[PDB]
Design a protein around this ligand. Structure first.
Ligand SMILES: N[C@@H](Cc1c[nH]c2ccccc12)C(=O)O
Ligand SMILES: N[C@@H](Cc1c[nH]c2ccccc12)C(=O)O
Ligand SMILES: [Mg+2]
Ligand SMILES: [Mg+2]
Ligand SMILES: [Mg+2]
Ligand SMILES: [Mg+2]
Ligand SMILES: [Mg+2]
Ligand SMILES: [Mg+2]
Ligand SMILES: [Mg+2]
Ligand SMILES: [Mg+2]
Ligand SMILES: [Mg+2]
Ligand SMILES: [Mg+2]
Ligand SMILES: [Mg+2]
Ligand SMILES: [Mg+2]
Ligand SMILES: [Mg+2]
Ligand SMILES: [Mg+2]
Ligand SMILES: [Mg+2]
Ligand SMILES: [Mg+2]
Ligand SMILES: [Mg+2]
Ligand SMILES: [Mg+2]
Ligand SMILES: [Mg+2]
Ligand SMILES: [Mg+2]
Ligand SMILES: [Mg+2]
Ligand SMILES: [Mg+2]
Ligand SMILES: [Mg+2]
Ligand SMILES: [Mg+2]
Ligand SMILES: [Mg+2]
Ligand SMILES: [Mg+2]
Ligand SMILES: [Mg+2]
Ligand SMILES: [Mg+2]
Ligand SMILES: [Mg+2]
Ligand SMILES: [Mg+2]
Ligand SMILES: [Mg+2]
Ligand SMILES: [Mg+2]
Ligand SMILES: [Mg+2]
Ligand SMILES: [Mg+2]
Ligand SMILES: [Mg+2]
Ligand SMILES: [Mg+2]
Ligand SMILES: [Mg+2]
Ligand SMILES: [Mg+2]
Ligand SMILES: [Mg+2]
Ligand SMILES: [Mg+2]
Ligand SMILES: [Mg+2]
Ligand SMILES: [Mg+2]
Ligand SMILES: [Mg+2]
Ligand SMILES: [Mg+2]
Ligand SMILES: [Mg+2]
Ligand SMILES: [Mg+2]
Ligand SMILES: [Mg+2]
Ligand SMILES: [Mg+2]
Ligand SMILES: [Mg+2]
Ligand SMILES: [Mg+2]
Ligand SMILES: [Mg+2]
Ligand SMILES: [Mg+2]
Ligand SMILES: [Mg+2]
Lengths: 46, 150, 20, 117
RNA sequence: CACGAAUGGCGUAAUGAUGGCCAGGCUGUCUCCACCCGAGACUCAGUGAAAUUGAACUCGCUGUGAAGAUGCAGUGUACCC
RNA sequence: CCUGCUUCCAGGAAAAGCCUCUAAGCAUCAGGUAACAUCAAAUCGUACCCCAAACCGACACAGGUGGUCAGGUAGAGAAUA
RNA sequence: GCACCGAAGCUGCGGCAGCGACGCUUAUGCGUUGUUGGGUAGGGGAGCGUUCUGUAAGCCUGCGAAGGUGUGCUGUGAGGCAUGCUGGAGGUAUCAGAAGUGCGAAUGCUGACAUAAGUAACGAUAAAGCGGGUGAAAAGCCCGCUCGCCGGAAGACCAAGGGUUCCUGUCCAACGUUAAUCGGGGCAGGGUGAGUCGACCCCUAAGGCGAGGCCGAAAGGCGUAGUCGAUGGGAAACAGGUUAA
RNA sequence: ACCGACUAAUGUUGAAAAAUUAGCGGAUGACUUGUGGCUGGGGGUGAAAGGCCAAUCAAACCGGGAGAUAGCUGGUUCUCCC
RNA sequence: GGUUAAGCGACUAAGCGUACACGGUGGAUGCCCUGGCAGUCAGAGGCGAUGAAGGACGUGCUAAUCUGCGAUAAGCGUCGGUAAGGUGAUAUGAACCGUUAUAACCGGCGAUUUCCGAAUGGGGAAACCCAGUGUGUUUCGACACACUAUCAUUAACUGAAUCCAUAGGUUAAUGAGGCGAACCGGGGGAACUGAAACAUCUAAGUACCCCGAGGAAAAGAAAUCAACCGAGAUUCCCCCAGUAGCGGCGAGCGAACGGGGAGCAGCCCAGAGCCUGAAUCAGUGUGUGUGUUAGUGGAAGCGUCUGGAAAGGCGCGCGAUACAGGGUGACAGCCCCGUACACAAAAAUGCACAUGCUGUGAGCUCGAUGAGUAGGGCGGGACACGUGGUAUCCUGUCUGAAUAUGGGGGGACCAUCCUCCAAGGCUAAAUACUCCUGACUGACCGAUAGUGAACCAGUACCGUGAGGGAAAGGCGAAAAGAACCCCGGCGAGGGGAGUGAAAAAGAACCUGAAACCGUGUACGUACAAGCAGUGGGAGCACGCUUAGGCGUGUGACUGCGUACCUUUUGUAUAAUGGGUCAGCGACUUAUAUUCUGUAGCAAGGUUAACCGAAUAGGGGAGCCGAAGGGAAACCGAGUCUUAACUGGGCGUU
């Protein structure tokens, strides 16, 4: 049957990508936390 | 401990023990039920009890003549070997040597002799009196101590 | 091994109501 | 001061398994099982130290009895004799003599019969 | 006992994988099950799981007993796998 | 062909490219039109799977996955053999 | 009515401990001696051992430390001492001092290993047979001849998504629910050629962002000019050949 | 074709965390479908079932207050003496 | 002796059990520590449009990854320092480079510094698409480079409705923007919970969101306290005291006066005249000193024994202002690196002073003295203080003075007295904190511990995402990491050989426990029924002993005999929990208070902070006790009760 993950990069980037993340005070805090955590992929982009 | 506060798995349903926080002392990594903190072990010791002890200590050092009091004690130059010899001649290895006013050379010698230390009159502490096999003390220091203890 | 993924359900499921 | 533990632990454990040597299966392999086996063995012993003195007395009394009957007299009468046989006291085990020295026994039976006359 | 008029009453052609009842046909649904063809089950070869599990040298009966006993009492039966 | 034609009500995107019109502006100029000649057209994608063993399903999983093409005999048929 | 059996009760022999008294003798301990010593909740008393500080520049230790495994002895016990083997570098009396100080249970936590068991199962009942190659080995790979199955697909081209799975050599440990010489598996090398296909690009829908601006305790909200956004509009190549790809 | 899910059997450590087979309903419409957009948690959306909002729903998920509180259940580790 | 008969009778083990021996599995224990943990003392407290934090892509003789670096790409220049060896790591090899000064390495200052990211020329699905304008070509097209965001301030030029004037528009100069551990001030601000329920109250102005700043922040120079004596800004510490008070007078909350300490500091504006740039502050250049960022010198041990190896034992010397520490084939003052100690800076810098330049005002005379404020009404909020008899403070709302003969406060309120001067500001120290730099310390951990991370870990993995988040350390002294031979499929794996102290240290490598699985031997086991042991007990095998019913192993037969925990009136229970092993896993810590023990001293005992020659000594602020009774005034070995006690209550030993 049709399951929950129906991949699509356009939507991926638009919803979770760097710039999207960057477009909101909290989206930025998202990055900030991940940087402080020393994460290797801030936001799974190209 | 470092982890989120998410419940690891459902209260009821899984065949599993209850489980609440992944930081639980019962669980593996992360725990310690009564983790210690930096702490202060300093005790009080009454004024009159401290003095009371020094007296019992001196008044026992004589009774084993481990206290040999002398008019003046000092070495002629800042050289350990000198002091080593004085002690040799005085028949001594392990010694406290409480000087009257304390001088440069007597201190720099003995800094490197291990079983021997040299203190001024105020520097007298209880463990040391007992620590060394013999306490020397100049007759000049004796009078200082005489009063310090009343 | 690599070998390390357990997503154990919920009981399993079917039946039971055991008269009330 | 953190305490390693666990060197003293296997000391305690092996101390028990050793006592379990000989027991069947888990009773001699598996501590948790052994510690029980080891205890109950102890329990029976403490009991059976008292039983031992019971079991042997009735062992003795059993064979005292046949020998008495063998010399034509029940155990009942026979102990009563020796009792009445001008005081005189003598263990029921020591009536050992019933197996190893049958004349001595018969001899004891007579002495007993006499008091009963 | 205890319908009732737009928390609608009474009717109604047509429609309904809607509820109840009947009949013809039909038949292995049944009387009552037989045979057959295929896939497993069985044997050999290869690979190789699972839940459960205080420990096991893990029988029947009548009785006892935290009151429904493989494990207690009594007794019957039973070569080992 | 057909974004046609007929008919009906529920009345059926936008903007640019394209054509034309001129304003400010340029009037020999510049531009505009045509013929011929010539030069430019960069950069990035291009393998392979794609109703599946290559994607979503933890698996070389009887499931889910939009578009395109469509032969013969019988047949109304993209049914069915 | 007299026997006798019968209990961890009574007695006898040896032993321990508390409280008594009496005698030996009092920084007490003996000898008697009378007596007391089931025990959950729980109160009191006394201890073993572990880690770490001092004592310790001492002491033990390559002529073998710790740990592991046996053995003997010893204590009322927690234990201790000794030593064989293993081990191959540390260990620490004594008296004090301080606690991450003792585990069988918590459907406790982590790891390892059992069990059922060499049992179920090996994923569509479209189906295989033989010959010949290769090979250590062929039911499964290669070639061939039959046989069977799909054929609005189980053929063919893509988008989306994947991201080297493509092709060629090489290997078969692990992956393949079996074997495997074979593979979408390992290793190495190769392979994607555009004015015209597509993206970029021009154009905008939904909608997003939004200089100023209006609004809001702060964060921010809405929106004009604009500026972005294809699922739609916008110039142009066809038939054939060739690469292992 | 495509979209549905009325019956049955199978399956229930499945081939499958919701399917297979045989039958069944709709099939020019309140139809069905690809791409993309908007709606956010006492809030959304709902031809209405408390349905759905990522295998989660009478208040989603992630982190935090946080060691919430638990007059309840469980467990609670060496020895000897009174 | 044969035949027959009756009686009794071992050796069997498909398999199983126990014991022991040798293994497998597995990774506990111990030993180890370039990793962690908690601190002390100092340094530093910021980075950023001169493009940060953080990334993408590159970069080598180089396929990957790490580090470094940026198309000048493990690097370039220069100044110092050092130098015999170097070209970062996994990581050999290649090709090189250097040895007395341009090898490398360390430090100071420079240079280069792709793309994304505040990202700033526009856009955008981050690391990409596209421009306007300027420049740029003895092959002056198209590409390459530079600049062009927004806001603020200032200036200039422009300039509507509207003529003036504004708004609007272009340019320009400056500054801002983003990131970052805590400490700090400010705007907002929960609920669980506690009250054994719950509204008031609590948790608590906490958690959290937000804004802002500094090296510290804030606070601060009395419209303050006191009580008729006096003190003299703010801040912090110890007292005062769990007192006075607040309080569904519940739960709880909880001061001040005064005292002892740390540190101490005071100034401007509300203004004009003269004199004028005179004090001072910051920004800045120089100088100097002093710290910093590389460095230099740095004492003294040999003999022998055991051993694979000496640092160990034993002997005899030697240095010590150096016996801190690390390393080296086992434990080294004298082998190495250091340590004490003494020295050193070409350059750049922190800090002090000294000045130069800029900006700034000093000084005397005479003035001035903070109104939509104080106060009030309404509503809230703050003060320990819940509206209470509630002073005081703040203000959303409506009001609204006096002005030195004036005004504030002294906890309702009034008088008198006393005391202070609101409605403008600045101000150092004692105080807080540690992303980070340096050095040092620990009755802190030692691989299930300690950071989640001793390891290429915020990784692999899981999730659309926020976000969650592992496992995994040890051959040896030295790789001397096993040439060569044999079985095998030019396999896997193994046996020899060889290295080594050890190969039983062989890389699946120190130690190598336990569950669990085998091979070997002894004994038992195929007529027997159950917690599997225990008391008895033959036989067998083995040792003994000189026998002597003895040790060890097994255990026919036999008496008795229903595991453990928990929970219960009571459990074999067919009631709970446990498949097994190993490791971990639960009464702690701080501060108050009271009792016991013990110690000191004694009608006295003891200090807190703080000073400090730093466990001493100083400091008696203070706390407890020596007197009680009464609500209290007050009285006092008594006092309270009452007019008063023959009394009575609490006290006097
Ligand atoms: N059979 C289930 C009981 C059950 C009934 N309904 C369910 C729904 C979901 C999960 C479990 C169940 C069990 O073993 O416990
Ligand atoms: N109780 C019924 C039906 C049932 C099955 N599963 C259930 C789960 C929940 C409630 C009911 C059920 C039965 O067991 O036969
Ligand atoms: Mg939580
Ligand atoms: Mg921890
Ligand atoms: Mg003191
Ligand atoms: Mg008896
Ligand atoms: Mg109604
Ligand atoms: Mg219908
Ligand atoms: Mg088989
Ligand atoms: Mg029965
Ligand atoms: Mg192609
Ligand atoms: Mg397959
Ligand atoms: Mg599939
Ligand atoms: Mg068909
Ligand atoms: Mg008892
Ligand atoms: Mg130890
Ligand atoms: Mg355990
Ligand atoms: Mg227990
Ligand atoms: Mg379980
Ligand atoms: Mg079976
Ligand atoms: Mg079967
Ligand atoms: Mg089968
Ligand atoms: Mg691949
Ligand atoms: Mg291929
Ligand atoms: Mg295989
Ligand atoms: Mg491949
Ligand atoms: Mg557009
Ligand atoms: Mg704006
Ligand atoms: Mg908007
Ligand atoms: Mg398109
Ligand atoms: Mg139809
Ligand atoms: Mg759902
Ligand atoms: Mg809790
Ligand atoms: Mg709380
Ligand atoms: Mg056999
Ligand atoms: Mg055996
Ligand atoms: Mg840009
Ligand atoms: Mg931009
Ligand atoms: Mg409550
Ligand atoms: Mg005065
Ligand atoms: Mg040097
Ligand atoms: Mg030296
Ligand atoms: Mg004033
Ligand atoms: Mg201020
Ligand atoms: Mg760890
Ligand atoms: Mg270990
Ligand atoms: Mg090993
Ligand atoms: Mg038999
Ligand atoms: Mg049986
Ligand atoms: Mg029986
Ligand atoms: Mg009950
Ligand atoms: Mg009870
Ligand atoms: Mg019982
Ligand atoms: Mg049972
Ligand atoms: Mg039970």
């Amino acid at each position: 049957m049709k399951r929950t993950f129906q991949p699509s990069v356009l939507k991926r980037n638009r919803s979770h990508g760097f710039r999207a993340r960057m477009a909101t005070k909290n989206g930025r805090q998202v990055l900030a936390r991940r940087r402080a955590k020393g994460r290797a992929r801030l936001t799974v982009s190209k | 401990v470092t982890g989120s506060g998410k419940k690891p798995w459902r209260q009821k349903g899984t065949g599993r023990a209850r489980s609440g926080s992944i930081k639980s002392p019962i669980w593996r990594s992360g725990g310690v039920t009564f983790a210690a903190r930096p702490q202060d072990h300093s005790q009080k010791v009454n004024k009159k009890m401290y003095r009371g002890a020094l007296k019992s200590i001196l008044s026992e050092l004589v009774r084993q003549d481990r206290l040999i009091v002398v008019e003046k004690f000092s070495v002629e130059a800042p050289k350990t070997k000198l002091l080593a010899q004085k002690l040799k001649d005085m028949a001594l290895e392990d010694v406290l040597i409480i000087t009257g006013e304390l001088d440069e050379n007597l201190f720099l010698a003995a800094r490197n002799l291990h079983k021997v230390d040299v203190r001024d009159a105020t520097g007298i502490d209880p463990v040391s009196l007992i620590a060394f096999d013999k306490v020397v003390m100049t007759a000049d220091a004796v009078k200082q101590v005489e009063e310090m203890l009343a | 091994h690599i070998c390390v993924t357990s997503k154990w359900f919920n009981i399993d499921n079917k039946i039971v109501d055991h008269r009330p | 001061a953190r305490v390693k533990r666990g060197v003293i632990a296997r000391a305690r454990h092996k101390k028990i398994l050793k006592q379990a040597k000989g027991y069947y299966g888990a009773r001699s392999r598996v501590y948790r099982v052994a510690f029980q086996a080891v205890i109950k063995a102890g329990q029976y012993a403490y009991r059976d130290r008292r039983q031992r003195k019971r079991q042997f007395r009735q062992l003795w009394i059993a064979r005292i009895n046949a020998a008495a009957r063998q010399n034509g007299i029940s155990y009942s009468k026979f102990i009563n004799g020796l009792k009445k046989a001008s005081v005189e006291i003598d263990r029921k085990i020591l009536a050992d003599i019933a197996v190893f020295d049958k004349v001595a026994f018969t001899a004891l039976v007579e002495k007993a019969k006499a008091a009963l006359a």
